Design a protein around this ligand. Structure first.
Ligand SMILES: Cc1cc2nc3c(=O)[nH]c(=O)nc-3n(C[C@H](O)[C@H](O)[C@H](O)COP(=O)(O)OP(=O)(O)OC[C@H]3O[C@@H](n4cnc5c(N)ncnc54)[C@H](O)[C@@H]3O)c2cc1C
Ligand SMILES: Cc1cc2nc3c(=O)[nH]c(=O)nc-3n(C[C@H](O)[C@H](O)[C@H](O)COP(=O)(O)OP(=O)(O)OC[C@H]3O[C@@H](n4cnc5c(N)ncnc54)[C@H](O)[C@@H]3O)c2cc1C
Ligand SMILES: COc1cc(/C=C/CO)cc(OC)c1O
Ligand SMILES: COc1cc(/C=C/CO)cc(OC)c1O
Ligand SMILES: [Ca+2]
Ligand SMILES: [Ca+2]
Ligand SMILES: [Ca+2]
Lengths: 525, 525
């Protein structure tokens, strides 16, 4: 065929593409199947085609984004805005609504607009990756550090707008977000916070501004195209130390979480964001499945014990990092060794104590936790051939028995659909993100379908136990919004009413987070 | 004359009140001149009458709130929701729009719904004062501590909904707000975050839920009536120590702020929210103006010197608190002494070192910063007869020169309108609230008119320098919103579209933060 926006003829789409070319330059409008292939989900879900873009437009300026949005309103073209488009696990760059035009802001709006060393912040355009920001801070001998997710090729801005997270004390990216500039769905531009007071220098010093705080309405959202975003940057501490605790039993998870909470809730001695990764997650970072089990179905217990023995890891591996003067590091590490020492079999290693293959993960977290971006986690996709992943991430109370129950519910479905269960518990002050990566052969349509069906059952199963996900893939967005339905869907009704108010023609990423504007509500897609 | 809602007849109002009576009980609907006098602004601003309530309704439950809002929609009666209604300095309980009915949620909805010791949170109704919650924590041998403003008789919820602040590490109340329940302007009820997932234990554990993050839109806002709100509660540390640094010269302000920033930006050694108060603010807390000066206008230099000598305080007095094991306190306090000691005339005191009258402020801060509510600061209102105050609170970069120019700018105008300039800088990580309390004789019409015209001038002057206010009085909300006018007022136009979409009848607190629903837009008020 040719992929087209819903309701839009071949003819009117050709016209609108030429309007875009007049705004951005012919170079920067892609509309052919060979050109669009790189903007498909690199980790596709389900057997069938889905989430197909009709074109890709790369603007160079806030002004060009306005003009793009005006043209889109004139023609009823839907727009999916991305920064770097690296949302792998949740859809890649692909739109939720098939036929949408991707607006890749970060291809050319990729400039670092300010890094302020005195007050510790940055003012960024969407194309700035973590690597770009790191090389800038290194170049200018900065005293600041950034906060990055596991992979460095994403966007500081784009990750924030999906409320992603990293692992330093500044790991809640949306919390340290300060000021943004946004083009609203009919082309008007707006600045939040002290940016709305012209001549203020405090756009990136004071988040709230005056009046209703709106910045949160542009995260996991479709109320506009963000063109600038500010973010706080932490001073680098004078030293740091990273550590691993290996735990032998699957059932250790309960005592691990329970001892952790008192050590974490006051942000000391667990100063950073700890991660609790199972042996499958760690083995996937350093080895192929076939090294351990070349056979059929779920991995047997003896192969698991071989994994743990060969890598000298446990079933549960705790990674953390301490910052500050060396005496403060010694004391805190002492408190952490005494507390988790009560769990029989716990073994402790610093980042200076492990140079084997099993310690490759520890060395990678020691980078990530010190604001040094990395791609070594890509090695996880070599667990199986042509590997891809989807993120199933329920929220869990920092309680041992609730975690244990989430672990068991998920592994039981994992086995049923013949998929390994790799887990990374990402631990905040009072909440945990229970990251379930399902790694699968993207060239196998049967595997792709099992992944769709399995995660659709897990969304439902988790919700029936009172567990929701914080973030999800294009293919699960409707399902996941449907679980947040207290008061006969009051939350969704709220978002719809606001969407239709700011977006009367229904242009911006329809269906993002399950939020469709009037003209699409009631169809399949 | 009877105070009536705009456009509502005497007969339609009387029917509407009776319907209110059928919902909450006849006891809980005040409407006579005598019953209303107590709900007028206790610190009135300007000579003229303004902000008059037409009635006060006191609901017992969320369901009654819903019914109140439905009746209001049917009769076009505007509703000013408040919790305890002690927003003194900003209007008290008085509505922005005269003729509004106050919905005082806190009078009967005053119950603590949950205090969770393990995860450290509260779930509260709007009527829970800081004293009430402190009493609960004391009776239950709680290991938690709250965070309170200077006056403990206000609402934890209400203060949060105006983005008020306290002085412990949890001093940013909105940040630690986690979950709320709200009756939207047409009577439907909604829960944010994990509260939207039926059966989740995580409403007060994970703030964001899924999809766009809305809770900020209900702060300093008129998009609904809030009926429940959660907030995180910090663990009480094993020890604390408060301290006072006195600085001799007016001109020291610049050096105090510039030495302060590097000790504050990493939240250590300045772990709490330091305040920097001037000698008038400290004298007003412990003495009357006439103890220093009886006569003509601004206070002369000899008299200021008498206050400093008699109270053993400086012109600028810096108050902080340290928390933790005594080794840590001592380390941090040694760092604070070594840095600020570089300013000639700096003098240092811990809370155990001063039992004189000048030390009463230090001892009050020592309570506040340890989560112990107080009404001692009410004494500042005895500076002059029939004392009242208004909060003019521009935001400042944490920069000595910026602080100095704000100080000079406000003092010049204070002099010009024959008022004393009481200052309390409230110091965040990257920003300062420059609290300018103007204390005045509320019974004197010319004094009230001076307050109105001086602060009108100050809003305009500050914004011409690139400064805005974080919070303001009823009388200044249109002037302050008007300064945030980047891109031809994009911010206010964004808020009005949301306002008109969730409040089609224009019911909830019209004019709050200068946001007026369409049916009032264009008129005087
Ligand atoms: C092995 C692996 C590990 C991972 N680890 C982590 C981790 O530790 N933490 C984590 O957070 N994620 C993690 N992820 C997920 C993903 O890699 C990152 O979150 C990634 O940074 C998101 O993609 P991005 O930065 O390119 O954002 P984008 O793809 O550019 O944006 C994501 C979404 O935000 C919205 N958006 C983006 N830009 C705009 C804009 N200008 N205007 C409006 N809306 C916009 C759109 O909805 C878009 O689809 C991991 C993924 C994998 C496969
Ligand atoms: C001497 C002095 C010192 C002060 N110090 C401080 C200080 O340190 N910190 C500080 O923050 N303030 C301070 N203030 C300001 C004020 O006294 C307090 O902030 C006070 O706690 C606010 O009043 P309240 O808690 O009763 O809230 P309320 O008056 O009950 O509510 C405040 C506002 O929030 C909104 N609101 C409240 N409840 C609801 C609801 N249920 N639904 C919808 N909207 C709602 C309304 O717009 C309402 O007017 C001070 C004032 C004085 C005079
Ligand atoms: C903490 O959030 C995430 C962490 C991770 C961590 C992956 C490491 O195996 C992945 C994600 O999406 C695919 C996330 O959203
Ligand atoms: C920090 O916020 C405020 C502090 C204060 C502190 C007053 C102490 O004199 C007052 C306010 O409004 C009147 C505030 O909004
Ligand atoms: Ca338990
Ligand atoms: Ca009923
Ligand atoms: Ca300076």
């Amino acid at each position: 065929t040719r992929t087209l926006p819903p309701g839009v003829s071949d003819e009117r789409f050709d016209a609108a593409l030429q309007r875009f070319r007049d705004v951005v330059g012919d170079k920067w409008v892609l509309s052919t199947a060979d050109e669009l292939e790189a903007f498909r989900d690199p980790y596709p879900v389900g057997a069938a085609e889905a989430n197909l873009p009709s074109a890709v437009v790369s603007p160079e300026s806030t002004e060009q984004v306005q003009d793009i949005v005006r043209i889109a309103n004139e023609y009823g073209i839907p727009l999916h805005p991305v920064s770097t488009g690296k949302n792998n696990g949740y859809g890649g760059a692909a739109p939720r609504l098939s036929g949408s035009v991707i607006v890749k802001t970060g291809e050319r709006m990729n400039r670092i607009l300010e890094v302020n060393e005195k007050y510790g912040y940055a003012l960024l355009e969407p194309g700035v990756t973590y690597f770009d920001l790191y090389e800038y801070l290194q170049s200018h001998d900065s005293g600041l550090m950034l906060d990055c997710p596991d992979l460095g090729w994403g966007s500081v801005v784009g990750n924030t707008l999906d409320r992603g997270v990293g692992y330093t004390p500044y790991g809640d990216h949306f919390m340290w977000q300060t000021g943004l500039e946004v083009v609203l769905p009919q082309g008007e531009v707006m600045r939040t916070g002290m940016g709305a007071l012209p001549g203020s220098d405090a756009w990136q010093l004071f988040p709230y501004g005056f009046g209703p705080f709106p910045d949160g309405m542009f995260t996991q959202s479709n109320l506009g195209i963000v063109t600038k975003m500010g973010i706080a940057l932490m001073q680098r501490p004078p030293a740091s130390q990273s550590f691993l605790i290996t735990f032998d039993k699957e059932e250790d998870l309960e005592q691990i979480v329970d001892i952790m909470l008192p050590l974490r809730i006051n942000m000391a001695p667990l100063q950073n964001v700890p991660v609790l990764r199972n042996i499958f997650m760690d083995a996937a970072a350093v080895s192929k499945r076939t090294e351990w089990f070349d056979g059929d179905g779920p991995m047997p217990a003896e192969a698991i014990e071989r994994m743990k023995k060969d890598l000298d890891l446990g079933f549960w591996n705790f990674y953390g990092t301490l910052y500050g003067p060396p005496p403060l590091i010694e004391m805190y590490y002492g408190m952490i060794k005494e507390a988790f020492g009560k769990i029989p079999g716990a073994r402790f290693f610093t980042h200076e104590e492990r140079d084997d293959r099993g310690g490759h993960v520890l060395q990678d977290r020691h980078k990530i936790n010190n604001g040094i971006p990395s791609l070594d986690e890509l090695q996880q996709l070599d667990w199986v051939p042509n590997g891809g992943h989807i993120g199933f991430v329920p929220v869990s109370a920092p309680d041992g028995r609730e975690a244990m129950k989430q672990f068991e519910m998920v592994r039981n479905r994992a086995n049923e659909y013949n998929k390994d269960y790799m887990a990374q518990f990402v631990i905040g002050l009072r909440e945990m993100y229970h990251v379930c990566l399902f790694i699968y052969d993207t060239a196998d349509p049967e595997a792709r379908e099992e992944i769709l069906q399995m995660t659709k059952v897990l969304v439902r199963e988790a919700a029936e136990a009172g567990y929701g996900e914080y973030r999800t893939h294009n293919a699960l967005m409707d399902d996941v919004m449907a679980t947040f339905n207290w008061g006969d869907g009051a939350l969704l009704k709220f978002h719809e009413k606001i969407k239709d108010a700011l977006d009367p023609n229904g242009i911006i990423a329809p269906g993002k987070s399950g939020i469709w504007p009037q003209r699409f509500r009631g169809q399949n897609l």
